[PDB]
A paper describes a structure:
Based on the density map of the C12 portal reconstruction, we built an atomic model of the portal protein BBRF1. The portal channel has two narrow regions that interact directly with the terminal DNA. The first one, located at the interface between the stem and crown domains, is the channel valve formed by 12 copies of β-hairpins protruding toward the channel axis. The channel valve is the most constricted region of the portal channel, with a diameter of ~25 Å. Similar to the counterparts in tailed bacteriophages, the channel valve of the EBV portal should play key roles in DNA retention and ejection. The second narrow region is a tunnel-like structure composed of 12 sets of three-stranded β-sheets radially arranged around the channel axis, with a diameter of 31 Å. Each β-sheet is formed through β-augmentation between a β-strand from the clip domain of one BBRF1 monomer and a two-parallel-stranded β-sheet from the clip base of its counterclockwise neighbor (viewing toward the capsid interior). The portal-DNA interactions are contributed mainly by four basic residues (H79, K90, R155 and R176) of BBRF1. Compared to the in vitro-assembled EBV portal, our in situ portal exhibited a more compact conformation with gradually decreased interior diameters from the clip region (31 Å vs 31 Å) downward through the channel valve (25 Å vs 32 Å) to the crown region (58 Å vs 75 Å). Consequently, the terminal DNA of the packaged genome in the mature EBV capsid is firmly held by the significantly narrowed portal channel valve, which would further alleviate the pressure placed on the portal cap.
Numbering used by the authors:
A (entry chain H), B (entry chain B): 18 to 92, 96 to 287, 434 to 571
C (entry chain G): 206 to 273
């Protein structure tokens, strides 16, 4: 048995998740792909798709028939274009009446408490290529937060549209099927759990609270006979990051050691009255520097002076674009830029959702009936993807079928 | 018999797959072609093609006939353009109702646990030109992970479309033949298996747990009498990377050795109160430097000083574009860029899939009936290649045959 | 209600991990979003500012050092 998580080199690797040892401008993009919300976009458009799929054509055609029956008692040859225009406004308020109730109920069910965290996911795969898959059997929160009448209180109006009375209930029970799958699963933190691998008859064993928990290999780590290395984006930069940390603390060491304005050899402070601030450090031993030979019989023939500044910010600056190139490459990040734009809109790609949420939503999260999304499904507005789903939805094609009468 | 894998020089070569010795911005692009997912695009559009081909024209024409029989009981001279418009919307929901079915089922079969990985292949071919082909006989996971009704309960609806009831079963059983072929195969790691060459009556021998395994040469190594060289991308850079590593560690050696501000000849720290920080290292022996002559009778006539900074970041900067040129050339990588773009979209080419996934899917993987892809098959979105396949698909040409009645 | 920071406090118990708020002597409701890394020696928070923390302190140190 050889440890994977709590080894000193591996927790040195797990530190760079946070910023404790070294940090540059390129590591700011590391939290950008660590943003959750693309997972909420995933389940969000998925359960919109699940709501809009189960609708029937026969429920809406007689709905339009009764809609015309509503307008004939309120309002001949001109009635042709009148019925065309009132159907057009009926389509517009159909989009409105699905959109308003749907965005209420789905932002309600979505932004309740979910113990599953994409934030807690994406940091692991880039660190180790390993995920701890925990199945927490506590699943009694969904009936507590959203039980009933949340779909019923908002829809009690004059016009008894059977389309929303059939689809809101079906999506409402469908949301109880999808939030169940996600809050039943669990991805933990790192500083208290551990992962374990054994050399002979090799398997990988996840351990938290004394028990073998599920897990999935995603990038197989290299275990040499003396050490373990993880095929990971962060450990691909590991000793360059540590070398930059070393030369930065080295630079501040030499800076702090050459502060004397003069070198001898033997043979409240930040803001104050500058006249007294002169006095408060001239008497201080920071000014003098007399270097020493150990042996008193040991004499010195000659002496030389060289203050030296190591190229500290030069060592930071190239490692910024080192981070930038690596997290543009192994995670496909296409910077949507303007003409001479300095990386203004850093966005997920087509294939990087297949390499991040592709494995996530299907392997460590057991979300079976969910799909991946497009570029413009994740780029556009989260309400502006709703009417765009509607632009290729079964109901609105049935309405554009009714678009020609 | 001469070893190939476990020799010290070749394991120094196998290390630079990971980042342990030297790493620059150019080696970030190595993970970009190391990205899997393009293999999922391969099997994805191949099983798309195996799905879309096995249709019959006779199934969809009477499906449209019964579709008109459905609409005559729901809805004369206007019926000409009514029937045209409802066929147009019928084609639209035909694309939609094949698309949601395939998108669920093929993402479901796609993101299974695949013990074959492109990631474990692409590193091996670029390291030595050699891959080990392992046929691991356990193939029992497909029937457990997916059995039945994953293709059915999504399509259990009102309109009994015989197009999906004919084609979903065939694409369903086709995946059972294709995921079988990939999960029967195995590509191993490197840190536990080895590759071996006998010079006498030359062949190559693979080993994992004491057996000669199958294997396939692709780039034949140079076996000299003193050493072995492999015609590989990384060993075409090998001692230049090692030279940059040597001068970088030498640069840190000289930087750490000239830290003293004063040169004699005999004959918590990162953040703290800076007044105490002066005191904590001035007493430290890091400040002084008294250089030694060995013999006490041996005297010194003259003495010098020269701090010297070797061009470390200069040696990194040209080797970045050294890596960039080599991984642009021997793997054909065309950077999709903007005007003065800093290499924003690094994408596979036409011929580089023939040099990487070409031999992969056909030689070490025994995926016989699969095909390679286009430029825009791998460039465009994985859901946006569905409708583009549909733009040249046999079903949709039959619907465009029906496009004029 | 949301308070300030300088007079309320927040408490984490490692044993049976929950979090306890305090203001005028009572446990108040709470919501985890970014759970911190608790090592045995210190606790660091997955936060935007503590992803910058010792770099900001390094810049403060070298600025006061420069004026020194």
């Amino acid at each position: 048995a050889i440890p994977v998580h709590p080894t000193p080199a591996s927790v040195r690797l797990f530190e760079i998740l946070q910023g404790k040892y070294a940090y540059v401008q390129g590591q700011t993009i590391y939290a950008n792909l660590r943003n959750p919300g693309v997972f909420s976009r995933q389940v969000f458009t998925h359960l919109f798709k699940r709501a809009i799929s189960h609708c029937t054509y026969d429920d809406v055609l007689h709905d339009w028939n009764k809609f015309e029956a509503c307008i004939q008692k309120r309002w001949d040859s001109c009635a042709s274009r009148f019925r065309e225009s009132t159907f057009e406004s009926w389509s517009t308020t159909m989009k409105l009446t699905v959109r308003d109730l749907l965005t209420t109920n789905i932002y309600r069910v979505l932004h309740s408490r979910s113990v599953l965290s994409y934030e807690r996911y994406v940091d692991w795969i880039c660190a180790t290529g390993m995920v701890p898959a925990v199945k927490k059997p506590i699943t009694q929160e969904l009936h507590s937060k959203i039980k009933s009448l949340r779909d019923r209180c908002v829809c009690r109006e004059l016009g008894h549209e059977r389309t929303i009375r059939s689809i809101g209930t079906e999506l409402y029970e469908a949301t109880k099927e999808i939030i169940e799958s996600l809050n039943s699963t669990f991805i933990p933190q790192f500083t208290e759990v551990t992962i374990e691998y054994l050399p002979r008859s090799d398997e990988y064993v996840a351990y938290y609270c004394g028990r073998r928990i599920r897990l999935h290999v995603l990038f197989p780590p290299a275990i040499f006979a003396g050490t373990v290395t993880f095929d990971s984006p962060v450990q691909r930069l590991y000793q360059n990051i540590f070398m930059c940390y070393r030369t930065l603390e080295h630079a501040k060491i030499c800076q702090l050691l050459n502060t004397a304005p003069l070198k001898a050899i033997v043979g409240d402070i930040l803001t104050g009255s500058t006249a007294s601030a002169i006095e408060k450090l001239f008497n201080s031993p920071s000014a003098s520097l007399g270097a020493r030979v150990s042996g008193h019989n040991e004499s010195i023939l000659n002496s030389f002076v060289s203050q030296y500044i190591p190229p500290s910010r030069e060592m930071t600056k190239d490692l910024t674009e080192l981070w930038e190139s690596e997290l543009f490459n192994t995670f496909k990040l296409t910077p949507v830029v303007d003409n001479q734009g300095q990386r203004l809109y850093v966005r997920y790609s087509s294939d990087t959702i297949s390499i991040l949420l592709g494995p996530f939503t299907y392997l460590v999260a057991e979300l079976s009936p969910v799909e991946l999304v497009t570029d413009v499904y994740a780029t556009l507005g989260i309400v502006e993807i709703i009417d765009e789903l509607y632009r290729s939805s079964r109901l609105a094609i049935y309405i554009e079928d009714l678009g020609r009468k």
